[PDB]
Amino acid sequence: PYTVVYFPVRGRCAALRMLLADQGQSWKEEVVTVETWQEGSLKASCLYGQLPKFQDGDLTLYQSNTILRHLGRTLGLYGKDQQEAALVDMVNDGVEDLRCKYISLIYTNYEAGKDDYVKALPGQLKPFETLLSQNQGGKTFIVGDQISFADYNLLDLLLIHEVLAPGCLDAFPLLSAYVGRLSARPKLKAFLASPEYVNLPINGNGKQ
Amino acid sequence: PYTVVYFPVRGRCAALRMLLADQGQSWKEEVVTVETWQEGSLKASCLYGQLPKFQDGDLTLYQSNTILRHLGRTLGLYGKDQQEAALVDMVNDGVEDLRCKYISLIYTNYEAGKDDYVKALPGQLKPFETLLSQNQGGKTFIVGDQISFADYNLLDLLLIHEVLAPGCLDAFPLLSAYVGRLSARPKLKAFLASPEYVNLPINGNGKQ
Numbered sequence: 001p002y003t004v005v006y007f008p009v010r011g012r013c014a015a016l017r018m019l020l021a022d023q024g025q026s027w028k029e030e031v032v033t034v035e036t037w038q039e040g041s042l043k044a045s046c047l048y049g050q051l052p053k054f055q056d057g058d059l060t061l062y063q064s065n066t067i068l069r070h071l072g073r074t075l076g077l078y079g080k081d082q083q084e085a086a087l088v089d090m091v092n093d094g095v096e097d098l099r100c101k102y103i104s105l106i107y108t109n110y111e112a113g114k115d116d117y118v119k120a121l122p123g124q125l126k127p128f129e130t131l132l133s134q135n136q137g138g139k140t141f142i143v144g145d146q147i148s149f150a151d152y153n154l155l156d157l158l159l160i161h162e163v164l165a166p167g168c169l170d171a172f173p174l175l176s177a178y179v180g181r182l183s184a185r186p187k188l189k190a191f192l193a194s195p196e197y198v199n200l201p202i203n204g205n206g207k208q
Numbered sequence: 209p210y211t212v213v214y215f216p217v218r219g220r221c222a223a224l225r226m227l228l229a230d231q232g233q234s235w236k237e238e239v240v241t242v243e244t245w246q247e248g249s250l251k252a253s254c255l256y257g258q259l260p261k262f263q264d265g266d267l268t269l270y271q272s273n274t275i276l277r278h279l280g281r282t283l284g285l286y287g288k289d290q291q292e293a294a295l296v297d298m299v300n301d302g303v304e305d306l307r308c309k310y311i312s313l314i315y316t317n318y319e320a321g322k323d324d325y326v327k328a329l330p331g332q333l334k335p336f337e338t339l340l341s342q343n344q345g346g347k348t349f350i351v352g353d354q355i356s357f358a359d360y361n362l363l364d365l366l367l368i369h370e371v372l373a374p375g376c377l378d379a380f381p382l383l384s385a386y387v388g389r390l391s392a393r394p395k396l397k398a399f400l401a402s403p404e405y406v407n408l409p410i411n412g413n414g415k416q
């Protein structure tokens with residue numbers, strides 16, 4: 001079945017977990033502590049020496065976006081055709097770019113860089129609002145009329161940004177309604193409210 | 209048909225161009241100068257305010273990896289099945305991670321960081337050598353027995369790293385043979401030797 005191997009944080013596993021939960025999939029969580037990681041064996045066995053590590057049967061995967069694409073490809077959450085598939089990729093790559101900036105702020109210079117980051121935030125969120133406005137008035141999904149792995153990844157990006165900069169979505173009606181709508185999906189809503197999600201820190205250094 | 213809109217550098221368009229050329233595809237190059245970019249209109253119209261911008265008919269794409277995946281999907285360079293597709297993604301995501309480090313060095317701190325970067329290089333290249341050793345002895349491609357978009361992306365990564373750190377591949381026999389083999393492919397070889405590739409700088413700040 002499915003097994004996600006990761007540190008006890010939401011981090012880069014938050015989106016894929018929301019996906020599995022919303023899709024009614026069952027999975028096993030193999031939690032790796034900082035202590036165990038510092039031992040060295042697991043790290044050495046990891047392709048790029050990092051987590052998350054994912055297992056689907058005897059298929060062992062690394063790279064969070066590879067896991068998302070795999071699940072999207074196998075579960076039918078990758079658009080209706082090649083054109084939509086490309087659009088889904090364009091969204092996910094954009095989500096990834098901002099996530100990298102977020103991760104850098106959180107772990108590299110939270111104190112000194114937070115103000116500048118928050119000031120620049122609107123311009124970084126704007127593209128996703130525009131994408132929504134061009135897809136059935138932002139009433140459905142980020143691409144097409146069916147959910148894709150990029151939706152879960154974007155949802156997480158928006159959720160963690162609300163915590164970082166409360167009210168950042170206020171100027172973006174489509175993104176706000178989008179977060180509420182997706183968060184209201186029955187299985188996702190239950191997951192987001194569960195201790196499994198709630199009692200896990202967003203990041204590993206206690207910053208958010 | 210195909211049109212790539214980018215600055216006059218190889219940068220993030222090198223791999224996709226090698227792909228198009230090796231695949232015998234025709235494309236148009238719309239070169240954007242720093243002057244024209246500084247004008248602002250094109251930038252404002254770009255989804256994430258950046259280039260490359262790609263056009264496949266009326267399908268307008270952004271994000272270099274989205275372009276690579278699109279071309280890999282439409283041209284049959286994405287593995288033979290879902291399992292291989294996931295492996296192709298794992299490789300490309302790894303290539304992307306190192307490319308980000310490379311881009312940071314080149315544009316952020318070449319002088320002060322080059323030594324540390326080059327020292328860390330072997331450990332960053334090792335994963336691709338290992339992948340190669342696990343696939344038919346590294347005699348064919350990075351994933352499976354047919355070329356994929358990840359091959360072209362990895363090839364470029366290796367090529368630019370050879371310029372940055374001459375001899376870095378000497379410690380990785382499979383990777384060295386791989387670069388020579390792929391570079392020897394008729395259409396690619398002609399492309400790499402052409403002024404269209406040769407007379408373009410690798411990066412935009414004159415560093416390499």
Ligand SMILES: CCCCCCSC[C@H](NC(=O)CC[C@H]([NH3+])C(=O)O)C(=O)NCC(=O)O
Nearest residue numbers: 007011012034049050051052063064065204
């Ligand atoms: C400790 C609690 C906080 C953990 C932070 C999240 S894990 C960070 C890091 N992993 C990554 O950055 C994964 C990046 C990879 N590109 C992906 O997308 O999965 C890691 O394994 N780092 C370990 C290492 O490289 O040694």
Ligand SMILES: CCCCCCSC[C@H](NC(=O)CC[C@H]([NH3+])C(=O)O)C(=O)NCC(=O)O
Nearest residue numbers: 215217219242257258259260271272273412
């Ligand atoms: C000037 C000659 C050198 C050009 C260097 C490469 S272009 C750099 C930058 N674009 C990107 O970094 C693209 C990143 C994007 N994630 C992708 O993968 O395509 C850009 O458009 N920057 C312009 C901007 O953001 O204003």
